[PDB]
């Protein structure tokens, strides 16, 4: 059909392609509205599932929480198409889907993404109003209830890392928290950002060792090796705090502190040559290699089931 996966797209085009995927594979993929943004845009996920069990284990794949990181939403929509294309053509994704559901949120910050397309390509935050300030938006990746208002966040609404007035104040973050909590039985939570070529695990808010650190590091290293096998792209691996910087209130620390074992952040390409402004001709190569990383992690979840 008429969607170029090697180009960047509007929010409406992305949502339309999600609907197309659900319509073309209605026994595998369903589009679910999980909430809405500050400006009342819908938040949509695709759920990929093969079983009508109750309480089937699930993994959550998150992208585009920071609106300027365009390679994340582009990689996510490509991933949606890859899952449906390869089902019953690749035993790896087929057996993953055999054992677990996958939820994919390609645009976790729709208002910010529209703003980057129409007003300021470098916008990061949400677009919520801050009473008492003319500064707009909170950093949705400092807004989660995991050492909220700790290190690496700001109390200042004008900051790129403003945490918001309280945990879950951003309706885009509350929507995901609420859906995961009600749905239950999550085993993985993977957040796609850019850039730096890093695959990280908890914690961002403290230097303390996650109980599962040895396993998470082992799985991240295998995933990085799989990712590098496609075109040679090298990733560094480690806990967020020392691998990028301290950051409190982040999505993967909230997921892990809530019992979701396989909690990882990818910082996708590149290492700073183009930074957030990654050329469209790198979308498909990035998404192809990232897929082997995501598959490796999900294979590990599968093999624990």
């Amino acid at each position: 059909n008429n969607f170029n996966y090697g180009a960047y797209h509007s929010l409406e085009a992305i949502y339309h392609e999600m609907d197309n995927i659900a319509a073309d594979f209605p026994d595998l993929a369903r589009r679910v509205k999980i909430g809405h943004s500050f400006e009342n845009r819908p938040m949509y996920v695709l759920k990929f599932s093969t079983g009508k069990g109750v309480r089937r284990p699930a993994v959550w794949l998150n992208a585009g929480i920071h609106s300027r990181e365009w390679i994340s939403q582009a990689t996510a929509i490509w991933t949606a198409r890859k899952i449906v294309s390869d089902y019953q053509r690749d035993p790896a994704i087929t057996s993953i889907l055999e054992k677990m559901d996958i939820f994919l949120l390609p645009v976790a910050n729709p208002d910010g993404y529209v703003y980057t397309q129409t007003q300021n390509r470098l916008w990061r935050k949400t677009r919520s109003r801050n009473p008492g300030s003319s500064c707009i938006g909170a950093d949705p990746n400092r807004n989660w209830n995991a050492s909220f208002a700790g290190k690496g966040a700001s109390d200042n609404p004008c900051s790129e890392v403003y945490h918001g007035p309280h945990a879950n104040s951003e309706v885009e973050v509350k929507s995901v928290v609420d859906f995961i909590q009600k749905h239950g039985n999550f085993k993985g939570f993977i957040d796609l950002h850019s850039y730096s070529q890093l695959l990280m695990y908890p914690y961002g808010y403290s230097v303390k060792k996650a109980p599962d650190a040895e396993e998470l590091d082992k799985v991240a290293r295998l995933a990085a090796k799989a990712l590098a096998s496609v075109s040679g792209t090298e990733y560094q691996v480690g806990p967020t705090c020392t691998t990028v910087y301290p950051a409190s209130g982040s999505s993967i620390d909230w997921a892990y502190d809530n019992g979701i074992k396989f909690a990882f952040t990818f910082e996708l390409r590149d290492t700073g040559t183009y930074g957030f402004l990654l050329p469209a001709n790198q979308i498909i190569p990035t998404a192809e290699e990232t897929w082997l990383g995501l598959k490796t992690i999900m294979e590990h979840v599968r093999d624990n089931l």
């Binding site: 920071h66 990061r124 950093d139 890392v161 850019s194 850039y195 990028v244 910087y245 950051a247 700073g272």
Partner: peptide, 5 residues
Amino acid sequence: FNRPV
């Protein structure tokens, strides 16, 4: 880098 990622 000079801005958060």
